[PDB]
Design a protein around this nucleic acid. Sequence first.
RNA 1: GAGGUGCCCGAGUGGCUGAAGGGAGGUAGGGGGGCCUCCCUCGCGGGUUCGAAUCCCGCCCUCUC
Lengths: 372, 421
Amino acid sequence: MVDLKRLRQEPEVFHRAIREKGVALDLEALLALDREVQREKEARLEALLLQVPLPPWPGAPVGGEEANREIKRVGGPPEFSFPPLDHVALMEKNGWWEPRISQVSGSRSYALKGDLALYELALLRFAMDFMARRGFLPMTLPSYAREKAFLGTGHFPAYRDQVWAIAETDLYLTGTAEVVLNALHSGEILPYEALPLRYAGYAPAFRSEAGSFGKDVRGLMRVHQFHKVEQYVLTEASLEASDRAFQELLENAEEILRLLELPYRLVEVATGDMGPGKWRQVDIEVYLPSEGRYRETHSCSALLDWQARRANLRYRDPEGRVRYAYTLNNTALATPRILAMLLENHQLQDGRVRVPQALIPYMGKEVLEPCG
Amino acid sequence: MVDLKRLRQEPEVFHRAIREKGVALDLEALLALDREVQELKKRLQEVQTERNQVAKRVPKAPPEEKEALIARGKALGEEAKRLEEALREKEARLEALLLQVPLPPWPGAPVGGEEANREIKRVGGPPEFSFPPLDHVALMEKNGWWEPRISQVSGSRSYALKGDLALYELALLRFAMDFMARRGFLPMTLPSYAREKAFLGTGHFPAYRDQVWAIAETDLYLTGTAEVVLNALHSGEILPYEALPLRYAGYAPAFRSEAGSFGKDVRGLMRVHQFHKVEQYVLTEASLEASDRAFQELLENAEEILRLLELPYRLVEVATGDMGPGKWRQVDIEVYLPSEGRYRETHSCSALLDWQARRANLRYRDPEGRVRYAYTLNNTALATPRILAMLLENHQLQDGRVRVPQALIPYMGKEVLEPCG
RNA sequence: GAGGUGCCCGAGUGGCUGAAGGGAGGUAGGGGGGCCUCCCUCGCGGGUUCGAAUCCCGCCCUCUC
């Protein structure tokens, strides 16, 4: 949400903002109703108000998807002395996955077998241990929550269609732990000394798969239910504060990937590809050998007070001023997507896969062995 | 589902089973509908044998005969259709009845409801506390491991853990998968939703339908046990004898409506909507010899797990009217919860003979080449958050901190759980 | 739009085929009646036609733009 006060006080910033972001809103109709609300007008204005976007940071490329700018890239592709097989053919070759699950649960489902299943639980634990050395508080959470939490983040209303509802219930399956994490402090006045709150939340994750392509979705890439470890920071209301936390989030995600031993790169995301409440978004993408290209594995985002005004997240500033706080989030690691890149990038001559040094602890072995 | 031929020739065994397992079925109406359906099938095979001679003789018949034959082939077709619709309506209704028929319990089971349950063995005892013991949620609040605000976000029978204890929960799930994998079982990670058919195939539908949450607008349901997925993987397939047994250890998040448990376990980790569970599932050849060998192996592994976890437990044989519709035999394992002055359930071992194999159509081909229905059994390996309620209370130290057992110090990397805020 | 056929790959768009041809003489499941004999099943269900693996409809899974 945005502050109604400076909205009517500075409507061009918002018109320009709606422009560069491609939102379907005629700000003039809304601005009409906020005049008439001085009965019905009240609530009609609210549903409209919840669609006003945050103005993008000045360094963002203007344009949709294709204006996204590579910032930098770290690492270089693998040196193969055999044709790289793809992730699905590696899995199939080793008995590491069960195809019969599409018959049980339907499409875009996965079931892992043998060392790939133990690997999957290994990377999740490694991600939570790392966030915990890094000062972020570990939480294990549910995957369901009431409607007001989705409004809180801004997932409702823009993405309602991407969320599964539990029938005969007031609950919805969450697509990410920031939904829950975001709603925890709703309604409290937080003390200034508590700030910043750094949370690393784990939970099962669910999506309807309204966003669908007829391309690499298959295997481990876009499945309905998956595992996520999310980073979440609630901070005081200043850009110097926010920029420092955005920087932290990014180093975290780059460090995990350095430990995991994967080629990656950072992409400034353009205003038309950002989504309504964002101030800034960078994507980290990892190189996928078989596809020959870089695929997203993380999206770092600052939204300032846009969602703190939806979820009522406040603090008490040192003058005794009560202010809305600023929020930020970034993935730490999510399985199984990350496994498609890990398997192609680390395949051996013989189709077995090696384990990055940093995970030999959590796995107990250096090479993932075949099964049946 | 039961062998309909056995049901036809031993109805008294079944009839006793119904009464003694408390099932509400009128086996004499089912037996009657069965006589109807089986007659109407023989009528229709008469009509179809006819259609099959006429349709074969339309070629070869002289353009004279040929036009007579077609008027007849046509009237015979319309009759068979009439007969087919009528047989659809009755078979449908008979299949509803047949999915309620219980498996007769093994002879050594206690006859009676809940209360007839006998404790079989107990290993370890109640702890001797030198100080007042704390309750597991008060222990959680004192070490700052409990996030109470999760109830405004997701509602009741919900929990969230903070700090070392959240890490503890995850270390316990890999501990169990590891134990299972060195015990010869295949580790698998699996989804938590499936189609109706899989619920029907384990016996969770029709009987426990109210226990299961549906995902609105889809043909999908959330499972409360990795058994629903696991059991269904081999439907239709005819497994080779040499593959048997199939021993799987499956991890999956579990969700439960917990409709009906009003006033029961309202605060704490004991009865929540969503939890993590690792399962022991075995599919074996059709001999009681083989089955009883497996039931012993499933009990053993779970016991071994509770010893490493340093916990007092007892096995309890379950009575006929508490085991549920398709079980031959079920033994529960309960662990002692200090705050309640009681043992509380942590695992259930259940042998179900071929009752779920012939709902799911799980068959194998034996050494003689005969195809026959298989045998299935299952038992928990470990389920979170409830063992954490037992581990915290049984291992509290007088200052409020909690000790971690020796078998999990390699996963925590510390010996006493450190408190948060 | 293209597909789904036996252990597996694959031939088969109206009767000839429960089924060609190869590897990883022969190599399916179920149900009636008396080893013989009949009915049903070519992903699941239903339909047109004297007759369907073949044609139509719906559903499920794979592949492509």
